[PDB]
Design a protein around this ligand. Structure first.
Ligand SMILES: Nc1ncnc2c1ncn2[C@@H]1O[C@H](COP(=O)(O)OP(=O)(O)O)[C@@H](O)[C@H]1O
Ligand SMILES: Nc1ncnc2c1ncn2[C@@H]1O[C@H](COP(=O)(O)OP(=O)(O)O)[C@@H](O)[C@H]1O
Ligand SMILES: [Mg+2]
Ligand SMILES: [Mg+2]
Lengths: 122, 318, 255, 317, 128, 317, 128
């Protein structure tokens, strides 16, 4: 890993941390507005949840009952999946920012010791 | 190393030097001897060099990779001397090709320590920039006459910030920057559309249509560049309708930038195409407007004018 | 000579990087101990001493002034490299230009968020300082949300407006080469975007508008501009004329 | 720059002279001549320098950027000497400002290089730590008095681990971080109350009460910061009666941390306050109990003691 | 000897990475100031001299040939490195191998994007 | 540093030397003296050293962290010469255990500096590799007799491209590269499965059953490796039904590539394990085939043969 | 003195990192070829010869002991740098301290998962 490699990786992951942080909010607005509307209906990339019902698979009165149990489950899980993705990206920023500084320092030292070798040998 | 410099200087000779009314000078400075013999006999066949009469139009100078640094440090000065006379004591139109001009810097730095100098940064001789200065400033159009100079520049360790190439930029009116990342995808010529500049990229000079399409291409390619790393993790579908449309167009523009060369036939398997200016501007204008968003991207790969891309898409029906 | 004899000068060093390289050549060939990047330990002393000669004199010494615009070329965005690090530390401020900005459309390619003037406010005319302050805060707020512009359809009311204001002012900051503007001409066009007249106009049309709008105010409203300059800010009278010129022009534009 | 650095320096001088009868020295280590002149005239203005008599509380030692590395590596030493007379002869508590410490290291690095010495890690001088030590060790409590130093820290490539900052942090007993976000939100002085820490912040040194109260303030502001995510996007009308208490209490504490300075009198209009240690502790302790739960939020902003929080909550009838 | 006597020879240098190290040692002990990465300023000339001697001869010189396959060891799969790019810049192309491809089953582990031939189809039969 | 070179070499001594007919030499080069005292007394207690008899099986040569550089620069040659005799002038079989051979090269830098050469890269001696050569080429099997050498190699700052370790690869028939990152996952021995090679890994020498399984394991471990960028951000929840499967298998294989050592019993408390080659193949053959897809990952962690993992799944309530 | 005359001593080197920098200063003023982070080739020897003098003697030599607790200050958890990896590969174990745990209020701030002291297990009381 060089500085070019790292700063490129840093900026992109810093961006993934941003989009994911806003998608945490968007899902939180959709989740709350859906959990407030499961109450009267009670008595009548979102992670594993899209596979959970698709793997378990392998009129008008009940069709609605499930369709408001879905949005509470989905916009909730998306809030959870994305709360992770941004926090994982945050940990990856903190880690890569540290690698970048070590590497910056090392390179400066290296490139300087090479100049010194050439001057003393004369 | 190995991204297309020579192939490109070869195609330009094919496209410009063959037509050119006047004299040309080719300098082989610290490159492959094989290439020189390849060049010699291609020019004899085409007639640009004639051994029998005296209608010859090219002068050759060679001090290749097999020579000690001193020969390599000076052959560029020999070439441009042949080019200097034709500029002044003939006053005519002169073309000057140098492959590779890096090998005058490298050479100079091969003997620097044995000359008693402390090395400057990255190993180079402390006189890098002035050695360059007193050499390059001779390669120029004066009032007595004209020199069109094409110079291949090797970029050590694939690093454009390397003292040698970095100091070469200031000596240039137009820059074509090849890229390995682009060559490894199969895009030839691997010119970087976001790092190649020219002094006459000005609406006042090339017109507003030429300039607006040009900047339009770069704009979409920069946009797609800044989505590249994000869409790879988050998935394609999460993109808005405006974006996944600039992704399709930029990827198609990316391929329409690639072109088969009359000189690279032994590499591509494709008959070389040369696309005139007005057919280039209009072609790219069209892809940007949206006129080809129903075509598969592989229609634009390795073709000539935009008409050939439609023909290719038609053939891909079966 | 100008600074000293009551006059005002502006010097451009294009560039100091190559002067450093040149001094390194001499330093090394005189066997002076090499340092970081092969530069001698007094390469800072070389630039620092030059750039501190630019000054604003008091009335007693003539009242003159010398302004320095040194130019530094970075290598692959390395502002931390020796010489960039030096001259950055000497100067009173920096204008950062960036490649990805340049090709995205932003020309001139100034990174508004990173560039600085420590002198800053204390050298703008009252009129500029009014619209500039509003633009500063509106763009900064924009920069926070800019990432969720292309990845947000379920935006709330308050942020959707911020994005729109942002891209608008961003376009208002774009400018052609070899065509500098008078300070009043400047505030006039920023005024349009700042007060939200271009909010409904399509972002791809802002360049066409500004060119036509500016051409118009220069043609007919020579007195309105003269007021913005002389009044020493945007007056109540000036606020009214602008509100009318823009609206009617804007309707006429989109027809 | 931007946030009220100079004002804080000019206030420290003024406040230390009034409370502890000690003078101040300011050392400009490779300072820009423009910013040097600007400080001189700004210091005349705030009254910490008097051109007419002898009430000036600061001395000025200047080593401008356009001077050789020798000069700029010694200016911290010229200032240290001046500061030392006030401690070792008049028995005062001296306040020494160095602006800034990086340029002291920078200057040493260059002298070293010019002397033909081999550079160290990251291009610094091999004598880096001793160059620091020989200077930084004279700034101490003797038995005859003390010199206390406030040094401006520049961090290269925003890297704390960088040899220049890294070395300095060995000699540091406190950090005062002037925050950017807190300045535009009105709060002055713009001191970040969570980045700023102290070594003498320990119950055995400053008493159990001083420790327990300020650790309570820190806890409340730290808990406030985490609650902000639940507040900003979800909604305030969700949290229980025990959480609403902590939100308003901490917001009132934030306001009480702001202060009108004596040097910012001819700029903001408000009168400047110098709050003693006892009144500082008791006020924040009182807010933590719930004694001022009834009072409006905008009372504690820009006041002296907690008594001024009463007069301002009355004037808004 | 084969090349200049109408015969055809192939030489393998395994590997030129180590010869450079030997050269580096020899140079530094001869007290010749180090250049880039501690190698002598002329490490390019070292290999350029040698590989330029691999050649195809015309019929007046006997029609012989010497073909060369120099071997270079990369560190951490970095072809963009100073020494690797020096040799790549001499030869008529490179076969590049990657440990990632090797372990995925792609064997030989040839990276197609980064490997090229500078003679191309001219070196193939019509059939190929 | 601290990955398990010494624990590896001690387990190897226990597992190979005791059960071979012949002599062994141990050279201690630039290492811990206490480790020498540890080895000596434990060899006395087991009876491979006999202070009364003539049946001793091991020659010891020691030149540790306390010796001048010259001494450490040559110790490797002394133990080597002892091993040279037993190979030739008996017509017999020798084992040679060196720990640590890096210290030879390291000791070369120390004297090279005072010998006044121009250093090569990283500060190292310009003679680095010829030094190593003339030394390494004597540690070899000949027609006259064989040396099985197991040398421990220290890696400066985990950089396998550092001249010292980088040059050592050329001298080996097998490489067992230990990985810090693997150890932090709690996997022992921390052998890097994708970075460890042997010249005997040939389908004509070990047979195709051994070759196909080995290669297949390296394939699934490589494929998992490129899946670890996507996981690192989004998690395993954003994966296909195909990729999820390779991951579960690769994680089961990663852990089954770990086993407790006899020389580790002292601190683990868990009995050490010795797995016959045919059982290792059968075990990994089965995980790949898909025969243990119902079992959990943690069932493959720190066991011997595959049977023991099956029994560990029952044990998990 | 205590080690050899039947007694038991404990030495604390606070810290060994700063001793390394002093010695680097010495080595660079002496003009000794720098390696990583400009440290001279023999920084390892500098600490190794010292830290070896801490030992437990048998009854035949008085039964004494010297115990060494050397301190190493890392930058931002970089227990992978030159001086930290030296001292790790010289001493018998490590007590690891993290900024992370200190802030939370785990005081003392020991990582009880990374820390090791294998030779201290035999020397632990049965009660414990
Ligand atoms: N224009 C192109 N079209 C197709 N292939 C190309 C093109 N340019 C280069 N190549 C391929 O890549 C190789 C490298 O090109 P070359 O000009 O020899 O590189 P350089 O001179 O920059 O070192 C060529 O041998 C050829 O196979
Ligand atoms: N195979 C193993 N099983 C369990 N723990 C191990 C194993 N190998 C190494 N370790 C851990 O690593 C530590 C260091 O071991 P050691 O071999 O002395 O490191 P080094 O590679 O420097 O020789 C041990 O104290 C132990 O905690
Ligand atoms: Mg070429
Ligand atoms: Mg060990």
């Amino acid at each position: 890993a060089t500085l070019k490699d790292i700063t490129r990786r840093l900026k992109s992951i810093k961006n993934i941390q941003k989009i994911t942080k806003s998608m945490k909010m968007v899902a939180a607005a959709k989740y709350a507005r859906a959990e407030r509307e499961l109450k009267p209906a009670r008595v009548y990339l979102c992670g594993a949840i899209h596979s959970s019902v698709a793997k378990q698979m392998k009129l008008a009165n009940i069709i609605y009952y499930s369709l408001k149990e879905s949005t509470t489950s989905e916009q909730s899980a998306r809030m959870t999946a994305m709360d992770n993705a941004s926090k994982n990206a945050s940990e990856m920023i903190d880690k890569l920012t540290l690698t970048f500084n070590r590497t910056r320092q090392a390179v400066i030292t290296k490139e300087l010791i090479e100049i010194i070798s050439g001057a003393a040998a004369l | 190393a190995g991204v297309g410099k020579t192939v490109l200087i070869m195609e330009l000779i094919n496209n410009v030097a063959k037509a050119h009314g006047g004299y040309s000078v080719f300098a082989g400075v610290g490159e492959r001897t094989r290439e020189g013999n390849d060049l010699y006999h291609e020019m004899i066949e085409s007639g640009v060099i004639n051994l029998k009469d005296a209608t010859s139009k090219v002068a050759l100078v060679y001090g290749q990779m097999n020579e000690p640094p001193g020969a390599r440090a000076r052959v560029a000065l020999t070439g441009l001397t042949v080019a200097e006379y034709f500029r002044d004591q003939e006053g005519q139109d002169v073309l000057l090709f140098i492959d590779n001009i890096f090998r005058f810097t490298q050479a100079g730095s091969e003997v620097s320590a044995l000359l008693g100098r402390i090395p400057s940064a990255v190993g180079y001789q402390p006189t890098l920039a002035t050695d360059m200065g007193t050499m390059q400033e001779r390669i120029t159009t004066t009032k007595k006459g004209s020199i069109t100079s094409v110079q291949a520049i090797y970029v050590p360790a694939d690093d454009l910030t390397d003292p040698a190439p970095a100091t070469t930029f200031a000596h240039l009116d137009a820059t074509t920057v090849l890229s390995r990342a682009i060559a490894e995808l199969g895009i030839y010529p691997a010119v970087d559309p976001l790092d190649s500049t020219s002094r006459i990229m000005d609406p006042n000079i090339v017109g507003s249509e030429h300039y607006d399409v040009a900047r339009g291409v770069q704009k979409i390619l920069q946009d797609y560049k800044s989505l590249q790393d994000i869409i790879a993790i988050l998935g394609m579908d999460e993109l808005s309708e405006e974006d996944k449309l600039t992704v399709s167009r930029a990827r198609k523009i990316q391929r329409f930038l690639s072109q088969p060369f009359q000189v690279a036939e032994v590499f591509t398997g494709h008959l070389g195409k040369l696309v005139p200016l007005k057919e280039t501007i209009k072609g790219f204008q069209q892809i940007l407007a949206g006129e080809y968003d129903h075509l598969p991207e592989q229609a634009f790969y390795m073709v000539g004018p935009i008409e050939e891309a439609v023909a290719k898409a038609d053939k891909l029906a079966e | 000579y100008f600074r000293d004899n009551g006059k005002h000068a502006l010097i451009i060093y294009d560039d100091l990087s190559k002067q450093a390289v040149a001094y390194r050549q001499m330093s090394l060939l005189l066997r002076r101990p090499p340092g970081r990047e092969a530069y001698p330990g007094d390469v800072f002393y070389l630039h620092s001493r030059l750039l501190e000669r630019a000054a604003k004199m008091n009335d007693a010494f003539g009242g003159g002034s010398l302004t320095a615009l040194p130019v530094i070329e970075t290598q692959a965005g390395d502002v931390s490299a020796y010489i960039p690090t030096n001259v950055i530390s000497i100067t009173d401020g920096q204008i950062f230009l960036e490649t990805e900005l340049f090709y995205k459309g932003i020309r001139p390619a100034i990174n508004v968020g990173l560039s600085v003037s420590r002198v800053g406010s204390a050298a703008q005319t009252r009129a500029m300082k009014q619209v500039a302050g509003t633009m500063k805060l509106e763009l900064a707020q924009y920069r926070e949300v800019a990432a969720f512009a292309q990845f947000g359809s379920d935006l709330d009311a308050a942020t959707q407006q911020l994005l729109s204001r942002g891209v608008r002012l961003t376009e208002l900051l774009k400018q052609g080469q070899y065509s500098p503007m008078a300070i009043e001409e400047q505030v006039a066009v920023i005024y349009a975007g700042v007060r939200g007249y271009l909010d409904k106009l399509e972002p791809s049309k802002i360049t066409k508008f500004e060119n036509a709008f500016l051409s118009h105010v220069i043609s007919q409203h020579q007195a309105l501009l003269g007021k913005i300059r002389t009044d020493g800010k945007i007056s109540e009278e000036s606020d009214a004329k602008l509100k009318e010129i823009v609206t009617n022009f804007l309707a006429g534009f989109e027809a």
